[PDB]
Design an enzyme around this catalytic site. Structure first.
Site, mmCIF file in Angstrom:
data_model
loop_
_atom_site.group_PDB
_atom_site.id
_atom_site.type_symbol
_atom_site.label_atom_id
_atom_site.label_comp_id
_atom_site.label_asym_id
_atom_site.label_seq_id
_atom_site.Cartn_x
_atom_site.Cartn_y
_atom_site.Cartn_z
ATOM 1 N N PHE A 36 0.842 -1.186 0.000
ATOM 2 C CA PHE A 36 0.000 0.000 0.000
ATOM 3 C C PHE A 36 0.870 1.227 0.000
ATOM 4 C CE2 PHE A 36 -3.139 2.453 2.765
ATOM 5 C CZ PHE A 36 -3.879 2.802 1.688
ATOM 6 N N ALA A 37 0.703 2.097 -0.979
ATOM 7 C CA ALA A 37 1.559 3.290 -1.107
ATOM 8 C C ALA A 37 1.351 4.317 0.002
ATOM 9 C CB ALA A 37 1.346 3.947 -2.458
ATOM 10 N N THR A 38 2.419 5.007 0.398
ATOM 11 C CA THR A 38 2.297 6.123 1.352
ATOM 12 C C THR A 38 1.312 7.158 0.841
ATOM 13 O OG1 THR A 38 4.613 5.776 2.142
ATOM 14 C CG2 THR A 38 3.575 7.829 2.762
ATOM 15 N N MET A 41 -2.026 5.900 1.426
ATOM 16 C CA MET A 41 -2.330 5.945 2.859
ATOM 17 C C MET A 41 -2.694 7.365 3.278
ATOM 18 S SD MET A 41 -0.135 4.984 6.281
ATOM 19 C CE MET A 41 1.013 6.324 6.155
ATOM 20 N N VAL A 42 -1.945 8.332 2.770
ATOM 21 C CA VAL A 42 -2.218 9.741 3.052
ATOM 22 C C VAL A 42 -3.618 10.117 2.550
ATOM 23 C CG1 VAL A 42 -1.626 12.036 2.191
ATOM 24 C CG2 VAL A 42 0.143 10.658 3.320
ATOM 25 N N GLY A 43 -3.933 9.699 1.329
ATOM 26 C CA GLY A 43 -5.257 9.943 0.772
ATOM 27 C C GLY A 43 -6.386 9.328 1.608
ATOM 28 N N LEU A 44 -6.188 8.117 2.134
ATOM 29 C CA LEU A 44 -7.181 7.473 3.024
ATOM 30 C C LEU A 44 -7.354 8.261 4.341
ATOM 31 C CD1 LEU A 44 -9.089 4.895 3.389
ATOM 32 C CD2 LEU A 44 -7.070 3.661 4.346
ATOM 33 N N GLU A 46 -6.719 11.681 4.592
ATOM 34 C CA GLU A 46 -7.447 12.871 4.179
ATOM 35 C C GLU A 46 -8.922 12.550 4.096
ATOM 36 O OE1 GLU A 46 -4.396 14.361 0.699
ATOM 37 O OE2 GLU A 46 -5.966 15.800 1.221
ATOM 38 N N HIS A 72 5.373 5.962 8.226
ATOM 39 C CA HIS A 72 4.795 4.793 7.553
ATOM 40 C C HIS A 72 5.793 3.677 7.833
ATOM 41 C CE1 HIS A 72 2.572 3.208 3.651
ATOM 42 N NE2 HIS A 72 2.280 2.506 4.728
ATOM 43 N N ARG A 116 -5.859 20.844 7.191
ATOM 44 C CA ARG A 116 -6.703 21.205 6.059
ATOM 45 C C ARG A 116 -7.204 22.627 6.230
ATOM 46 N NH1 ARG A 116 -7.463 17.033 3.156
ATOM 47 N NH2 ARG A 116 -9.190 17.956 1.946
#
EC number: 3.1.2.29
Lengths: 133, 135
Positions: A36-38, A41-44, A46, A72, A116
């Site tokens: 699973f890409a960082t 993971m960041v998008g999940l 957000e 991570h 955000r």
């Protein structure tokens, strides 16, 4: 929205959220580990913060990431369930900061902070076009 | 195999298409439907890793690769499709397998973020043998 409030969502990792799918344009990523890409993971993370804020955002409003600071520390192959929790760290002006953490049912895979800024969609989109070639 | 030099500046240039927006990161997400059409933070994170990866490549031994183990960056201006994002990555220090980086990005108009990124050199194979134990 209240300091301390939490939201959690869960996501079973598919084959197409691996490193290489993130940038199919990268030869340098072709032999990356199937994990699973960082960036995903960041998008999940957000995504968790976005859903949690949604009911408190007036009409026409939205938000755009302004910071991300995470570790991570363990890798997750496809098929594990990633649980993400977002906790409202604080609030100042149009800015909300969250503490975010992720585990895969086996290891804690990362945590940190995410900021955000709330935006008026229409206004902001106008600008973006202003920046478009 | 020579080693890498601290302070060395490397650049990675990427012309942002229309498929690196918020929504394209997670097409699964109805909650993103309304996001502006701008380069996603998650994709910027990946672009910065990408930059460090290209740099460190002709320095890695056969069988070897790397993994981002941390990132800590701002995302202070948004970028529409068409602009070129240049990433500058500069090596701070290498302590064993751990490489540490100072990264920033500019879309030709605004600086769009900066911060740090850390990576870990691995033997790709033997790493897979460890993760497999999780699949």
């Amino acid at each position: 929205m209240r300091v301390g409030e939490r939201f959690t969502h869960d996501f079973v990792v598919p084959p197409h959220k691996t490193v290489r799918h993130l940038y199919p344009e990268s030869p340098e990523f072709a032999e990356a580990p199937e994990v699973f890409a960082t960036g995903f993971m960041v998008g999940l993370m957000e995504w968790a913060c976005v859903r949690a804020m949604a009911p408190y955002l007036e009409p026409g409003e939205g938000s755009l990431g302004t910071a991300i600071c995470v570790t991570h520390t363990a890798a997750t192959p496809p098929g594990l369930t990633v649980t993400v929790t977002a906790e409202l760290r604080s609030v100042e002006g149009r800015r909300l900061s969250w503490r975010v953490s992720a585990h895969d049912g086996v290891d804690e895979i990362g945590s940190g902070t995410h900021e955000r800024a709330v935006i008026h969609l229409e206004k902001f989109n106008a600008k973006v076009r202003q920046k478009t070639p």
